[PDB]
Ligand binder design. Structure first.
Ligand SMILES: *[C@@H]1O[C@H](CO)[C@@H](O)[C@H](O)[C@H]1NC(C)=O
Ligand code: NA
Ligand code: NA
Lengths: 29, 253
């Protein structure tokens, strides 16, 4: 996989983008 | 993208734009899946009912664009799924483009993952939301001017996957397992869709298991943009991954 799917400006810096939580919430609800 | 928002800087670093080389013209979205391979929709490259049949030499891709951040690459070759059905319903709407040479990764250029069986099984469920990005039109139609529906920044919209019976019920087109549909229902209030120019671009989902982004879909076709009771249709990436892998294994040494 190497580092696929891990964004340098987000995951790699432990930052969330403004709407990703909405995606994860839909999986859990 | 209709009813989306401006992407944050570096939000979608796998984003690729497909252009006619000269004269210049934005054709489609695409996505970066390694330093040398770009994934797109077959109909972006081959579609005889609109007299479309591009070769490698007809095209350029742009990578890392938000709004020296951005990279222009030539293509070595294009590979279209052998069983892509352009005659009927766009079944197997998928193509690969191999870059002339590998690109360097940066903060703005980074590949998306392809799903494995477990990720696809877990996440491809009715109501689960994915994310679509593109430089396509902001609405199906314009009211004041042609440019009020062309965005200056990459656009992003989150959309839930829809129940298969609802997808099939919404259109006369014969839909196959190699397609899923996504978007809000009339009664859900919220809106959004891909539109002209977004085709070929990625539908991605973020794994709760490993927090990586996975490309589950490719913007394929719709009936208008953001219409009540209509949904966007997307190529089922995982269902076609053996073909993807076969192409990369054969032509990627
Ligand atoms: C362009 O023409 C056909 C149209 O169906 C296409 O399948 C093919 O890839 C291209 N032609 C040749 C000779 O390869
Ligand atoms: Na769930
Ligand atoms: Na709709």
């Amino acid at each position: 996989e190497a580092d696929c799917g891990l964004r340098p400006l987000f995951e790699k810096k432990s930052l969330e983008d403004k709407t990703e939580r909405e995606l994860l919430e839909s999986y859990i609800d | 993208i209709v009813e989306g928002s401006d992407a944050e800087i570096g939000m979608s670093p796998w984003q690729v734009m497909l252009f006619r080389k000269s004269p210049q013209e934005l054709l489609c979205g695409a996505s970066l899946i390694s330093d040398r391979w770009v994934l797109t929709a077959a109909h972006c490259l081959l579609y005889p009912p609109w007299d479309k049949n591009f070769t490698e030499n007809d095209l350029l891709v742009r990578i890392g664009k938000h709004s020296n951040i951005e990279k222009i690459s030539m293509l070595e070759k294009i590979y279209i799924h052998p069983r892509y059905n352009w005659r009927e319903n766009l079944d197997r709407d998928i193509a690969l483009m191999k870059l002339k040479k590998p690109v360097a990764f940066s903060d703005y250029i980074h590949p998306v993952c392809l799903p494995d069986r477990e990720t696809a099984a877990s996440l491809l469920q009715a109501g689960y939301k994915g994310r679509v990005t593109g430089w396509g039109n902001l609405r199906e139609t314009w009211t004041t001017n042609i440019n009020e529906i062309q965005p200056s920044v990459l656009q992003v919209v989150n959309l839930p996957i829809v129940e298969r019976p609802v997808c099939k019920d919404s259109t006369r087109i014969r839909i196959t397992d190699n397609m899923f549909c996504a978007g809000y229902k009339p009664d859900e209030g919220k809106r959004g869709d891909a539109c002209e120019g977004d085709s070929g671009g990625p539908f991605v989902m973020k794994s709760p298991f490993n927090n990586r982004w996975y490309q589950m879909g490719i913007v394929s076709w719709g009936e208008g943009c953001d219409r009540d009771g209509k949904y966007g249709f997307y190529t089922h990436v995982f269902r076609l991954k053996k073909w993807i892998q076969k192409v990369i294994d054969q032509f990627g040494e």
